[PDB]
RNA sequence: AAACUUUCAACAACGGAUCUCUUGGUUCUGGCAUCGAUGAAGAACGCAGCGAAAUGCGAUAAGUAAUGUGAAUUGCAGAAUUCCGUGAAUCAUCGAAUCUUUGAACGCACAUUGCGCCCGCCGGUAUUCCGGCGGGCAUGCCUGUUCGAGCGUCAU
RNA sequence: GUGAGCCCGGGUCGAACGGCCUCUAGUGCAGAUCUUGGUGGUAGUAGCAAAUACUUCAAUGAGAACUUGAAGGACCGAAGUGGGGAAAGGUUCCAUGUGAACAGCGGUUGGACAUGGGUUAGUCGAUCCUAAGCCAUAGGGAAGUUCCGUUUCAAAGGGGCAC
RNA sequence: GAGACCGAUAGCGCACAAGUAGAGUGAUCGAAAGAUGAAAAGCACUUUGAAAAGAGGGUUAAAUAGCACGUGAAAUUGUUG
RNA sequence: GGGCGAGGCUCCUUCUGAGUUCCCUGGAACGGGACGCCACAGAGGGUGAGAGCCCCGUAUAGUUGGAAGCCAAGCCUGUGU
C-alpha cells in the first residue's frame, strides 16, 4: 500500500545530547509516543523503496 | 407517583396515602409507598407478594 | 526530454485488465448478435474518399450514406434506418463517381 | 458533586454497573480467548471525561 | 479440477468456511457412511448423523467399538458414543471425541424425514444413474 | 510558578458533552462541537484528516437500516407473502 | 410543585361568554344562535362571572367550554361555508 | 404450560386475543415476583411467557394491519406506513406510464416506420 | 468445577501480578523517554528547570 | 589451599530469537447500482436464568411472525421430542412486523429527562378539581381550496 | 575448501525439506548520539533523615512497631490535625469476607480485592426572572461554508358588542 | 475469483472484546498482544506446609508439552567439573 | 389497430463415482508394501501424520419444485371515419 508506514504524525526531537534525530511519534499515554517512524530501518515504518 | 399509585391499584387492589421516590445509583427507580391504616402491608406482603 | 516534474505517479494508468476488457467486449459482442438475429450486427456504411492530399488516394467507411443517395437509390429516408442502413444528412455529392 | 445533571447521573450509573469482573463460568466456555476484564475501570486510575 | 467460475479452491477460504459454519451446514459436513447391508437395503452411500444412530468406530484406538450415539455436539466436530468413554483423574466418566467420518452407521433412527432423505437420495441416484446409462 | 503549582486551579470545563456525537468536545460557552460541528446541520469533516474522517464514517457505527437494504435489492424490493403461508 | 396563577382553572376554564364562543367557532352571530338553537346549547349561569370575564354584565350570555368543544365537531359548519 | 403457539393464534379475533395477552401479563407479573424470591424450573416459564406475548402482539398486529390494508384496497390516499418503501429515490422515480409516454408524432412515425426484422443474403 | 474456576481466574492475573498493577483496572502507561527530559539544549538564558 | 575475578564444558535459569503454521493483510481481475422527513449515517441508553466486552437485538429487546431444513443448545443450571412431529436449533432464508432517547431532527427549548398549546378517550364524589392514555402543532417552496386587503384598473 | 562456506557424528525436537540447470528479488551488517525488544556492571550501592512520639498488657492470627480493646504519654490549639459546604471526582459511603498484586517497610489492616446494601421533599436547591452577553425571525451581504441584524424600510393582534 | 506478494518487529495502525486500551481542555494522537495437547485425558489419592506450593503417585506417545504452556538461540545468571 | 402464442433465456430449489480389503511401523495411518476400483470428478478443505475411492465438496449432462420478467417461430380477427 502506497500510504503504509506514513498514517503517523511524528517529527524529530532535534539536535541534542540524548537520542538520535529519526521523527519520534508525538502524544502520550501509549507504548507508540516516542517511538521512531518513516524509517525503513524503523519498526512499524515504510521500506526503502515500495514495489509498484 | 401517580402512575405507581395507580398501577398498584390496578395489581394489587392497594391504596396509598402517599408515594416517595428516588432513583438508585445503578439508574432504576424505588418507591415507597405508605399504604392506608385500613389494610396491613404485612397481610399484602405475605399474601399478595409473597414476600413472607 | 522527460516529463516527470509534476505529481505524475497520481494519475499513472496501467492495463492489466486489458484481455479482461477483451473478454467483455467479446461477451457484449454476442449478446447483441443474439439479440439482433437474424439482422446483421452493424449497419451498412457508404465508401468515401479522405481529406488532404496525404490520404485522398484511399477510400473507406463513412458515417452514412445521404439522402440525394437514398432518392436515387429507391429507398426512403424513413424507411432506410429500419433496415440496417445509416444515413448521414451533412454529407453532400460533389461529383458523380 | 452532589449536584448533579440527570444525564452525568444516567452515565454514572451504567458506569457503575460496568464496573465488575468477568464471570466465573466465561473461563470454561469452549475456545475462550477472554481472561479477564481489560476495561474495567476505577475512581484512582482512569477518569471517565465527562 | 474445477470448473465453475463460483467455485473457490482458496484454502484460506475453505477453512473459515469449514470453521466458521453455522449449525445447519456442520450437520451436513458431520456425515457418516451407512454400512453394507444397509447400503444394499436403502443405495445410499451416506446420511448426516444425528442421535439415536447406532454406529461402528472403524479408525482411531476404539476400533470396532459398538454403540449408540448419545450426543451430536457440533460445536467442536465431535459425537459421544455410548460407553466409549474414558476416566479423568477422579474417576468420573467423561465421554470420548469421536469425528463421525471415523465411524460407520450400522442401525438407522428412522423417522418420517430420514425416510423422506432416503427415499430421495435414492431416488436421485437412481435417476443419475439411468441418465448416465 | 506556571507549571506544577499553577496545575492546581484547573478546576472548570472548557467542553461538555456534545448531545449529537457524544464527545466531550461541546464548548461550553460557544454552544459549538469541536468534533462534529454541532449545532451546524452538516457534521464537520475535512480532508486534511483522513484518520478523522474513518474514525467516523458510515458503517463504523451500528447501520441499523442501512444494512439490510442489499438484501431487499438482491431479492428486488418484494412485497407480500410466500404462497400458501400461514397467516391473516 | 410550581404555583398556580390565578384565574387558569375552576369558572373560567369552566364557562366562556357568547363573544368568545362565537369568536372559537369562527362563525357569524345568526349562524351561532342557529346551531345553538338547533343543538341544545342553552344559557349557563356561574356562581361568580367576574371569575369568568371582569367586564362582564347581567346581559352577558354564558355557555360551557365543553358544549363550544362539542359544537367545533358539528358538520354543519362545513355546510355553512360551501353555502357561502 | 407458558408456551402459545401461533397456529392456536391464527384462528382466534381481536377479543380473545387481547384476553389471551392480559393473562399472560398477569402471569409474568406475578412470577417475576416468583422469581425474584425463589428460582429452580421456574425461569423457563418467564422466558415461555415472554416469546408468548410477543407472539400474541404480533398476531394482533398482523390480523389489524390487514383488516386496514383490506379498508384502503380501494382509496387513492394510502397511510405512510400503509404504503410501499421500496427506496426514496425509487418512490420519487417517475412512473411506469408517465415515462413510457411518447408524443403524437414520435407516435405516427412508430406506427409507419419501425424497426423491422430483416437478414441479408451472403 | 467451583474450585477449577477459581484457580482459572487466579491463574488470570499472574502477568499483571508481575506487571505489579493494583488490579485489573490498572492500564496507566507512563512515559519513560519524556520529551522535556530527552529533547533540547541548555542556554545562558532562561532554563526549562532548577 | 579456599574465597573472589576470568576462561571452557554439562545441566538448570532469564529471555523470546529461529523453524514450521495462518479463519489476517496487500495487489490484480470479474460482476452489481441499492442510503435519507414512509426519518438516514452517527450518538446515547437498555435487552440473556446465570455477561463486563465483542456479537445480535429494541420494552414484541442475544428477540416475534413467515418459508425451508429436520433433532439440537452446551460453560453450568433447567427443560425437551408424543421421534412417525403445526417441530429442537446461538440453524438457514427472509417478502410480515416491532423498532427506547436522539440525530438533517420538526411545538418552544435542552449544560433542564424544563415549559407549552390543540383535539379526543378513560379513571377518581365531580358542570369547575386531579391523574393517565392516544393523535397532532418546524421552515422554505409548488399546485389547488377558502378567507381577505389595497381608488391599483374598471363596470354599475 | 586459500576463503565466503559446504558436509558428517552426538544430543534435542516434532512436519516438512533439499541437490542440479535456468528464472526472479523487499537477497548477505559492528557501527548510522540506529529502530524495537531483552539483559548487565554500577549494586545489595545511593538511600528510604521536613511536619516534636511513642510505651505496657490482653485478644486475633501462621506471622503484629505501624490491627483492635484497655492502660499511660503526647500533638493539632477554634485563621485547628474540629464540625460542614461550592468546584472537581463518581460509589471512594456501609456491612461481611480476602490468596496473589498495590499501600517505596511489614500487614491479620486499607480509599486495595470479592459479594451485597445504601441517596425517600408542595416548604432545601434546580426548575421561574433578568444582568454582562449569546442565538432565531424580517431584511440586507456573501461563489459559498455562512456574516450582519434582535426592532428593523414586517399586513408581526388583543379585547368588546350585535334581533 | 485469483497471485513467482507478506508470514506476527513482516503484511493495513488493527490475524486477538483495534480505531480498542491509553493520552490530550480540544482539534486530534493512538499501541502492545497469535501457537498446551489428537483428545483436558488440565494431575484422583497419600503426605508436608497458614497458604502459595513441594514430594510421592499418575494422565499422555511425550509434562524434556503443567492454562508461566510448540520449538526454545544470544546477551546475562546459578550449580557442578 | 388489437388478442393469443408453441418454444427459448434469466434466478432460487431435489439429487449424482469409486476400498475404510490384507500385512508392517505408529498413540492415531492420511506413511510403506500388496491387491483392486472410479475418473467430463487426480480443484480445495476436514478427519488423531502426505487420503481421487472416510466426509463435505469437485466435473458433466441433466433431473425435481416455484415465482417474476424479457425475447420469440407462428395463428386468429377490424378496416380507413
Ligand atoms: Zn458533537
Not at chain 1, 524529530?12 to 516516542?34: L, M, N
Not at chain 2, 428516588?22 to 399478595?48: Q, S, Y
Request: glycine residues 6%.
Amino acid at each position: 500500500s502506497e500510504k503504509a508506514g506514513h498514517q503517523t504524525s511524528a517529527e524529530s526531537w532535534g539536535t541534542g545530547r540524548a537520542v538520535a534525530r529519526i521523527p519520534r511519534v508525538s502524544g502520550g499515554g501509549t507504548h507508540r509516543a516516542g517511538q521512531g517512524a518513516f524509517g525503513n530501518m524503523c519498526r512499524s515504518g515504510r521500506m526503502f523503496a515500495p514495489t509498484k | 407517583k401517580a402512575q405507581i399509585k395507580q398501577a398498584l391499584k390496578k395489581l394489587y387492589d392497594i391504596d396509598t396515602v402517599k408515594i416517595n421516590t428516588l432513583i438508585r445509583p445503578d439508574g432504576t427507580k424505588k418507591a415507597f409507598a405508605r399504604l392506608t391504616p385500613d389494610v396491613d402491608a404485612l397481610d399484602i406482603a405475605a399474601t399478595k407478594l409473597g414476600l413472607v | 526530454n522527460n516529463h516527470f516534474r509534476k505529481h505524475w505517479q497520481r494519475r499513472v494508468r496501467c492495463h492489466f485488465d486489458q484481455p479482461g476488457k477483451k473478454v467483455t467486449r467479446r461477451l457484449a459482442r454476442r449478446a447483441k448478435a443474439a439479440a439482433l438475429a437474424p439482422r446483421p450486427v452493424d449497419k451498412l456504411r457508404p465508401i468515401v474518399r479522405c481529406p488532404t492530399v496525404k490520404y485522398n488516394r484511399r477510400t473507406r467507411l463513412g458515417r452514412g450514406f445521404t439522402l440525394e443517395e437514398l432518392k436515387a437509390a429507391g429507398i426512403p429516408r424513413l424507411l432506410a434506418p429500419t433496415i440496417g442502413i445509416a444515413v448521414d444528412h451533412r454529407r453532400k455529392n460533389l461529383s458523380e463517381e | 458533586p452532589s449536584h448533579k445533571t440527570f444525564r452525568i447521573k444516567q452515565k454514572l450509573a451504567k458506569a457503575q454497573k460496568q464496573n465488575r469482573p468477568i464471570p466465573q463460568w466465561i473461563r470454561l466456555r469452549t475456545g475462550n480467548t477472554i481472561r479477564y476484564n481489560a476495561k474495567r475501570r476505577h475512581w484512582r486510575k482512569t477518569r471517565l471525561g465527562l | 479440477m474445477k470448473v465453475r467460475p463460483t467455485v473457490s479452491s482458496s484454502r484460506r477460504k475453505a477453512r473459515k468456511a469449514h470453521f466458521s459454519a453455522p449449525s445447519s451446514v456442520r450437520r451436513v459436513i458431520m456425515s457418516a457412511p451407512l454400512s453394507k447391508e444397509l447400503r444394499e437395503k436403502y443405495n445410499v452411500r451416506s446420511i448426516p448423523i444425528r442421535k439415536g444412530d447406532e454406529v461402528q468406530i472403524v479408525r482411531g484406538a476404539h476400533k470396532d467399538k459398538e454403540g449408540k450415539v448419545t450426543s451430536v455436539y457440533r460445536l467442536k466436530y465431535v459425537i459421544h458414543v455410548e460407553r466409549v468413554t474414558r476416566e479423568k483423574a477422579t474417576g468420573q466418566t467423561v465421554p470420548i471425541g469421536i469425528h463421525p467420518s471415523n465411524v460407520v452407521i450400522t442401525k438407522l433412527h428412522l423417522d418420517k424425514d430420514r425416510e423422506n432423505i432416503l427415499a430421495r437420495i435414492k431416488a436421485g441416484r437412481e435417476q443419475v444413474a439411468k441418465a448416465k446409462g | 510558578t506556571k507549571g506544577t503549582s499553577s496545575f492546581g486551579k484547573r478546576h472548570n470545563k472548557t467542553h461538555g458533552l456534545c448531545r449529537r456525537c457524544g464527545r466531550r468536545s461541546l464548548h461550553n460557552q460557544k454552544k459549538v462541537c469541536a468534533s462534529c460541528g454541532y449545532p451546524a446541520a452538516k457534521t464537520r469533516k475535512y480532508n486534511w484528516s483522513e484518520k478523522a474522517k474513518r474514525r467516523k464514517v458510515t458503517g463504523t457505527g451500528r447501520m441499523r437500516y442501512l444494512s439490510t437494504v442489499p438484501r431487499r435489492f438482491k431479492n428486488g424490493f418484494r412485497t407480500g407473502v410466500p404462497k400458501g403461508a400461514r397467516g391473516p | 410543585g410550581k404555583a398556580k396563577k390565578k384565574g387558569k382553572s375552576g369558572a373560567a376554564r369552566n364557562y366562556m361568554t357568547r363573544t368568545q364562543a362565537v369568536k372559537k367557532l369562527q362563525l357569524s352571530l345568526p349562524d351561532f344562535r342557529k346551531l345553538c338553537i338547533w343543538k341544545g346549547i342553552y344559557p349557563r349561569e356561574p356562581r361568580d362571572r367576574r371569575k369568568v370575564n371582569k367586564s362582564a354584565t347581567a346581559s352577558t350570555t354564558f355557555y360551557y367550554t365543553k358544549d363550544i368543544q362539542y359544537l367545533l365537531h358539528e358538520p354543519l359548519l362545513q355546510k355553512f361555508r360551501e353555502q357561502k | 404450560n407458558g408456551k402459545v403457539k401461533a397456529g392456536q393464534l391464527w384462528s382466534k379475533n381481536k377479543e380473545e386475543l387481547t384476553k389471551i395477552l392480559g393473562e399472560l401479563k398477569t402471569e409474568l407479573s406475578q412470577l417475576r415476583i416468583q422469581k425474584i424470591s425463589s428460582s429452580g424450573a421456574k425461569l423457563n416459564k418467564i422466558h415461555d411467557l415472554r416469546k408468548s406475548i410477543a407472539r400474541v402482539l404480533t398476531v394482533i398486529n398482523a390480523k389489524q394491519r390487514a383488516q386496514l390494508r383490506l379498508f384502503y384496497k380501494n382509496k387513492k390516499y394510502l397511510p405512510l406506513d400503509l404504503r410501499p418503501k421500496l427506496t426514496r429515490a425509487l418512490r420519487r422515480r417517475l412512473s411506469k406510464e408517465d415515462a413510457s409516454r411518447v408524443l403524437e408524432k414520435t407516435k405516427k412515425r412508430l406506427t409507419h416506420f419501425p424497426q423491422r426484422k430483416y437478414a441479408v443474403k451472403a | 468445577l467451583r474450585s477449577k474456576a477459581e484457580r482459572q481466574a487466579k491463574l488470570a492475573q499472574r502477568k499483571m501480578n508481575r506487571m505489579a498493577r493494583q488490579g485489573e483496572a490498572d492500564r496507566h502507561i507512563h512515559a519513560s523517554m519524556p520529551k522535556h527530559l530527552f529533547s533540547g539544549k541548555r542556554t545562558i538564558g532562561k532554563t526549562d528547570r532548577r
